[PDB]
Amino acid sequence: NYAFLHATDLLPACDGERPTLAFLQDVMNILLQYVVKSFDRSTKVIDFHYPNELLQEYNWELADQPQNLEEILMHCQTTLKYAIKTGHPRYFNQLSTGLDMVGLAADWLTSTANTNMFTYEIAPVFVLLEYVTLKKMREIIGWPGGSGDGIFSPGGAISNMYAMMIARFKMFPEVKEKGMAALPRLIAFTSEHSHFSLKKGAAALGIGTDSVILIKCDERGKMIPSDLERRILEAKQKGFVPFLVSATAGTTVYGAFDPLLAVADICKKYKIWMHVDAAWGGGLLMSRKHKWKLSGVERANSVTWNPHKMMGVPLQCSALLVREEGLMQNCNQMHASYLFQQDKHYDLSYDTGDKALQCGRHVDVFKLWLMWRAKGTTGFEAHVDKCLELAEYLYNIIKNREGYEMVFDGKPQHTNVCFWYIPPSLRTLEDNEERMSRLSKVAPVIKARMMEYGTTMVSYQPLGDKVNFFRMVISNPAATHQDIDFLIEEIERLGQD
Amino acid sequence: NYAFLHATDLLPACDGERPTLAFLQDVMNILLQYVVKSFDRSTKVIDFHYPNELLQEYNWELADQPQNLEEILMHCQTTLKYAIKTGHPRYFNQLSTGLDMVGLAADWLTSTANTNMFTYEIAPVFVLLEYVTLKKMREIIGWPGGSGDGIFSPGGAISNMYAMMIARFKMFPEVKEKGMAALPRLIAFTSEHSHFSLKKGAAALGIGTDSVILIKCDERGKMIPSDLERRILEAKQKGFVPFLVSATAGTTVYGAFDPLLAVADICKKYKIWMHVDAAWGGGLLMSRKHKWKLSGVERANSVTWNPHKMMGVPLQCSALLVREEGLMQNCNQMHASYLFQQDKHYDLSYDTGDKALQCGRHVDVFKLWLMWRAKGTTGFEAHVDKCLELAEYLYNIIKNREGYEMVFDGKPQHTNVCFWYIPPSLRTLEDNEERMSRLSKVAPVIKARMMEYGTTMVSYQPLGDKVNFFRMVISNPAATHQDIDFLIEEIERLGQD
Amino acid sequence: QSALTQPASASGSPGQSVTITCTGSSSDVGGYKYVSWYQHHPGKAPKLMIYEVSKRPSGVPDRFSGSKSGNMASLTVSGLQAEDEADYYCSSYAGSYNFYVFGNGTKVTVLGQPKANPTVTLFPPSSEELQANKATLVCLISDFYPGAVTVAWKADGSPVKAGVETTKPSKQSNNKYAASSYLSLTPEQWKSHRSYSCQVTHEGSTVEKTVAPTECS
Amino acid sequence: QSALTQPASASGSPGQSVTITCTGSSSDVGGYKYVSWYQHHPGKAPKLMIYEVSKRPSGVPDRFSGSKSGNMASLTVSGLQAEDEADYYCSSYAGSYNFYVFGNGTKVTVLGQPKANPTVTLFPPSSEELQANKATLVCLISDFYPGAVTVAWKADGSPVKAGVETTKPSKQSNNKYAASSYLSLTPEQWKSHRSYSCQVTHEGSTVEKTVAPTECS
Amino acid sequence: EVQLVESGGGLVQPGRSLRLSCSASGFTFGDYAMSWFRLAPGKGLEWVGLIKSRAIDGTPQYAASVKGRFTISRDDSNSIAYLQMNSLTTEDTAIYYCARDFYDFWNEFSHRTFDFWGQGTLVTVSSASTKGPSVFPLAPSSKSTSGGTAALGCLVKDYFPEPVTVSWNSGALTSGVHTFPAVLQSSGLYSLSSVVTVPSSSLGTQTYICNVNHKPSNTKVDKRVEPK
Amino acid sequence: EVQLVESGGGLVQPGRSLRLSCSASGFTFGDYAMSWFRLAPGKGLEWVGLIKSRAIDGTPQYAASVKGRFTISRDDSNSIAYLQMNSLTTEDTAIYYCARDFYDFWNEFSHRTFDFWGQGTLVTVSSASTKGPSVFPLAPSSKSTSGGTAALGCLVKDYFPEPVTVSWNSGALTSGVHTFPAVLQSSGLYSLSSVVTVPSSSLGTQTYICNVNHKPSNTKVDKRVEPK
Secondary structure (H helix, E strand, C coil), X not given: CHHHCCHHHCCCCCCCHHXXXXXXXXXXXXXXXXXXXXXXXXXXXCCCCCHHHHHHXXXXXXXXXXXXXXXXXXXXXXXXXXXXCCCCCCEECCCCCCCCHHHHHHHHHHHHHCCECCXXXXXXXXXXXXXXXXXXXXXXXXXXXXXXXXXXXXXXXXXXXXXXHHHHHCCCCCHHHHCHHHCCCEEEEEECCCCCHHHHHHHHCCCCCCCEEEECECCCCCECHHHHHHXXXXXXXXXXEEEEEEEEXXXXXXXXXXXXXXXXXXXXXXXXXXXXXXCCCHHHHHCCCCHHXXXXXXXXXXXXXXXXXXXXXXXXXXXXXXXXXXHHHHHHCCCCCCCCCCCXXXXXXXXXXXXXXXXXXXXXXXXXXXXXXXXXXXXXXXXXXXXXXXXXXXXXXXXXXXXEEECCCCCCCCCEEEEEXXXXXXXXXXXXXXXXXXXXXXXXXXXXXXXXXXXCEEEEEXXXXXXXXXXXXXXXXXXCHHHHHHHHHHHHHHHCC | CCCCCCCCCCCCCCCCHHHHHHHHHHHHHHHHHHXXXXXXXXXXXXXXXXXXXXXXXXXXXXXXXXCCHHHHHHHXXXXXXXXXXXXXXCEECCCCCXXXXXXXXXXXXXXXXXXXXXXXXXXXXXXXXXXXXXXXXXXXXXXXXXXXXXXXXXXHHHHHHHHHHHHHHHHCCCHHHHCHHHCCCEEEEEECCCCCHHHHHHHHCCCCHHHEXXXXXXXXXXXCHHHHHHHHHHHHHCCCEEEEEEEEXXXXXXXXXXXXXXXXXXXXXXXXXXXXXXXXXXXXXHCCCCHHHHCXXXXXXXXXXXXXXXXXXXXXXEEEEECCCCHHHHHHCCCCCCCCCCCCXXXXXXXXXXXXXXXXXXXXXHHHHHXXXXXXXXXXXXXXXXXXXXXXXXXXXXXXXXXXXXXXXXXXXXXXXXXXXXCHHHCCCCCCCCCHHHHHHHHHHHHHHHHHHCCCEEEEXXXXXXEXXXXXXXXXXXXXXXXHHHHHHHHHHHCCC | CCCEECCCEEEECCCCCEEEEEECCCCCCCCCCCEEEEEECCCCCCEEEEECCCECCCCCCCCEEEEEECCEEEEEEXXXXXXXXXXXXXXXXXXXXXXEEEECCEEXXXXXXXXXXXXXXXXXXXXHHHHHCCEEEEEEEECCECCCCXXXXXXXXXXXXXXXXXXXXXXXXXXHCCEEEEEEECHXXXXXXXXXXXXXXXXXXXXXXXXXXXXXX | CCCEECXXXXXXXXXXXXXXXXXXXXXXXXXXXXXXXXXXXXXXXXXXXXXXXXXXXXXXXXXXXXXXXXXXXXXXXXXXXXXXXXXXXXXXXXXXXXXEEEECCEEEEECCCCCCCCEEEEECCCHHHHXXXXXXXXXXXXXXXXXXXXXXEEECCEEECCCEEECXXXXXXXXXXXEEEEEEECHHXXXXXXXXXEEEECCCCEEXXXXXCCCXX | CCEEEEECCEEECCCCCEEEEXXXXXXXXXXXXXXXXXXXXXXXXXXXXXXXXXXXXXCCEECHHHECCEEEEEECCCCEEEEEECCCCHHHCEEEEEEEECCCCCCCCCXXXXXXXXXXXXXXXXXXXXXXXXXXXXXXXXXXXXXXXXEEEEEEEEECCCCCEEEEHHHCCCCCEEECCCEEXXXXXXXXXXXXXXXXXXXXXXXXXXXXXXCCCCCEEEECCCCC | CCEEEEECCEEEXXXXXXXXXXXXXXXXXXXXXXXXXXXXXXXCEEEEEEECCXXXXXXXXXXXXXXXXXXXXXXXXXXXXXXXXXXXXXXXXXXXXXXXXXXXCCCCCCCCCEECCCCCEEEEECCCCCCCCEEEEECCCCCCCCCCEEEEEEEEECCCCCCCEEEECCXXXXXXXXXEEEEEECCCEEEEEEEEEEEHHHECCECEEEEEEXXXXXXXXXXXXXXX
């Protein structure tokens, strides 16, 4: 067969069916083996290879003629060999680590259905799924009866940019016609530990990073009210316009919670739009045991929530929930007499018009909806609580051991364990102020050893003036107590002497 | 049995493997049964359902308790039943139509491999595949040996924004810190028939719609050079700054080709960045029979190409190709450090991750690359040449058959046939202007009856002055002569007396 | 939609100054600095007087002055002349959905003072009308200045808001300073109320004309 | 890297004027309006004279003037005074990647007259050095005017640019107007050339000092 | 200078289609925005629609009310804009004015202030033709209730098309008479009235007549008879 | 008002680490950007690094040369900035200056112009190990070839640390003698020289001496003997 066959003879051709069935089964049979192997603890996550070597090894060149199907099956198999085993239990490198079975199956159906949420006519069910899902998310927030506006966005960075654009357009719409140059200086407020997406948005949207003011954070990791009120006072005195205050519920570096209720009264006092970033915070909303941390969310105007990090959903699903109805269409849409014409087969009230900068977007809702059906709110609560338990387990160990120093004040957040590790030989030396010299190199050396033996993966970073620390994050469903105990032992075994 | 089984009983449970191995296969059976049945002419193109009917017909509400697997299989089946099949031969309602098997299988592999192309460290092969594919694409344009910069973008609208952002940053770097208020008035130039996304980008990025000049077109949709050069002179005289000229190759309504040679010599003359929007014209770049159509493309500074529109690639895949190396990194980074250098093992030259606004990146390359292997340039040429043969045939029939009138002068440019059809009763009324009243209603009535019957679906639109006309597009891979003949007869048979 | 609130009439004497108000909403006058004022002479083309809060166009003298604060704009005509007698309209940009909005306009008349109190005279329906099956009560409000008048109909002490109209000022000098007000009823509706009153309000005072009851209360 | 091109020295007499140039590239001086000029007097902190092409800061005299055109900026000192004798550095923003860039610097000297002819004296290697296996040629340039002086070494009419340095001026005594230039060689390298010359170029004229060839034609 | 001239007005039946033209002069028309406004009799100004500069975009904007039955159009080659009105209602009766943007078309403050208004053109949409004028007397309801002077009147109703001609004592009275401008009362009743003031001594003893003429019909003569 | 005082300088061996402090006064330090510059003797100013306001960013930016071996730091509580230098090269020899941004943190033109320059602190980096001053005579090759006058000299080399004290004929001459500025000659040769002018006929029969003293070592005496 495949050695003399080509893409041409498959579907939509008349002859297509029997070869196409065989080919798609053969492809799936490789994926099925990859999955079961990838989830096992004995399967090594990566063997590291420089860009140049990995290229030179194999034919990646782009053919003028059609290649024969046998080769195409091998190209799949060879790629799946070389590619990372991302099912692994001891793999904590990224915030959205791991894969879920029903989500995987759903994301295959998503792509197979092969349509976009540009209009109701071309994607009927999927548009209706977006409505119910976003409505239910607004209910979980605290907004009455799931009331308000919403869009599914391809990752947090784009949600933040859309939210900033809306927050501007709500003060002055005239940006659309005349641009940011024809308006007063728009001042925005944000935490000292904030993620880079806000900087990127500010540059993109033409407001600039200098117009974004950074307010100081306490020992624990949260935005100080005095400095916040002072910056608003300074701005509003000097003839500048405070328009956006971005409050960070679960900072991506540290897991830290700004005081939403407190900030909300300040927002109300100075008439300022309230953005709540919960992109690494969202999961916590599910757990009725622990929900008290997020009190004040009910006041917020625009909320960025990521399901993909927190609920397990296949990658780059971000949800932007906006309190006031109608804003997104008017903000982003030119007029417009093609999509939003009133002579349609259905009345225009069900639209679902042009609500983003991007024109048309894929039916990404289905996976999250099907997962929410399959796992439920109770399953999401279970997961979050089990992660918080594991963090408290890990804490109790590192609390009662030499050479482990927490970066933020008191016990875990949230599930972030931000720590420095001190090698045996370094532990015995008095503070003479230059000890950072030795400390900086530790995390790189440990990272090399960890990856080279493939035994676990933890994230390492320096942040401002603070030298290289470990950011251990429990978001993996297959992690256990044994793996934590192993990790603590392994770090000592590598770090010595 | 799937009464007794839940998604929590699947992997990574210790009994998980066996039900997991079953469930994925049973889902895949439903997907194959959906796939094969799509590519038949006997099956109706559309069956129409209002919002509220579907919401009472089926439970779409989201769950608190976990729901057993048989319900989840029903949810999948039910969704695929009600959803519109986008593979169909007689479906010309949207520019995106059709579905190739190798792209499907690749996008399934992608969703299983489950990684982020923002760095080489977790997406090894995929980063190399991006490089080689984009190098070959830059070669094909006319830039020496595939040198230049390039990014995979989710859609043309976002590609226009990236291009406009780079164009701005090239002339004035300051925008990042300073914002739009600081800088001289940026003026942009574009064709009068140009797509609304370019206008949306202008609003979004803080530049404003007013400062984006439409220059007037002829009968064919092609931009007048004299008015362009004069408006550039006028602008630059008044102390404004011409930065961007966005010239169109294959306009999305008429299929029109701007004079690239003229614009290129204007770009030299007044030192202006050249954007060639070839999103709906890009397919022709493969062919060596018809290459003369794209004359001037070799001197362009930034090129937009959409493979998903023009080579049949499963949805979301736009490529922005930029002539000068390094620009995208410099443009989009918001610190010098930036955590991919210098500690990390991999070289700067291929990663180079922080070169886009988004903070994770989809693996949109793999589908396109595996299709380009399996079909080749020769397949892409043959596809295009066959589509152009059908368009030649179609025009030759309808023009010389009674009661057809064209929206623009001469042969389709292009496979876009923009036409009016005149019902028998109307045909005698040669009289100026009054006949507009009936004519403006014909295209709605025909579209309504077409959707009711489910026999063939063709797009309609008004464009500015031009009252509601039929827009026949031939991007469907499963098109053949018989459908064209059927559609011509169907329009006359329905559109009477 | 929104219409900007302007007083219907204003007046002053030659060489004096006068100021006119235009009170909008937060979605128009309060939301933007783009407030314009037009001058309109009867049967002619509108003329721009003020743009951008307080700026004049070429060929309008420097005694017309504009200003605004919050939700309310003001036009001030200093150094009044006879020819300054016109309708003055205010307008604002009001966002994409409404686009523009206008006021109800203000008639400025140059002479001022309560020069002449109105003389009111009432006429009851004729025999010819009652036979036809209609009843018209006609009220004439003669020779009065300022030109502004608020006239109301009362049947047996109750206000009547139905089936009425009053004719607007025209070119003629004697019909500029007089008003006619017609109330139309049916016979078996007119018979039910014994007493009909026509009361007018003007800058000087109030003046009421009536027909007294034909039975004892 | 980009270093902005500045003339080494410039001069004038009291009550006249002098203008200093700072020529960059199209990507620094030609590209941005953020161009500064500093004044530096020995033993004292740098002082901002001009910022943003032509703006002065608080309490700098209103006769220092800034200007620019294309890829070249200018500082112009009108009504020249004695205390204006200093080093003048120019600097530009160079975009985000390189941030700032600076010039070479310009020495302004207040006199503007070639008062005296320099006295040049050359000295062959010391006997003690030659025994050690070293050779140092010393050239002393006394009493030069008004400002800077440029000295070069030629062995048998060929330029020697290696193993040499000249002593930078300082405020004390006549060390402003006296310079030493030392050339260091080895004996079996120094013996190869017949004749050693120390030639100087200065504002007033030209002055050349040498030791004549061992063999004469 | 800049001059805008509107034409096309007149009396038109309801449900019909009608085109108003606006011919511009004094500027390079194809690069300039043009806007339509409407002034309704005895009420304010309203915006109807706007068509933009083709440099800026050129797409026409309309008001909610008239959307899908009014259409604004251009002929840039002859410097002339059009407003096409389809399916006219009697409530569409108004004077329609043409207006030019105040600022130059490239300018930042473009599309915000309008000037150079035309004379406007009147559009009247028919209330339907009917029989000649009905004349009614307005005179005292009881004997000698008057002071030093007495006032008589004629009320004329139930006419259309307009206008009517009123005469007192066969053209004798050019003084002591007041004829009011025509008004429109409920149910499509056009209505005019005239008063005559005479001495109280004369009343009942001297013949006074009102004469009304309407040229598309017949003339009427009405006598003031004794109050007693 | 604003005053910056830098400290921590001195003579340091290459490869060793050194910390410079900059103590601010006259402004509220925590709201302002701080920038480090370096002045090498007669080689102009160079940028070292920049740390921004914590209200606007707060992360340090460095120059190519010093990247990953110099480190800039703050103590906002005591209005004091630091530059830590690790693994010094001889090419890092300079006077190091502290500087304040010209504009306030809210301002559009912030982070683009620097002012309020400190006094600076000298950092010299040296691997010299030479012992005591070596004095060399500079006198004519043969008698009476210089005309009416003759100039003699003493050349002082090898001295470390800087400098030396030179006197002619046991401190009899501070007038008519010129001692030239100290400078570094190729391969660690710190170098000074002094001249004395005498009559041409005085040579041989009159003795002229140069006396040189060097504080961490011992004194030297050199005589001009007849050039036979």
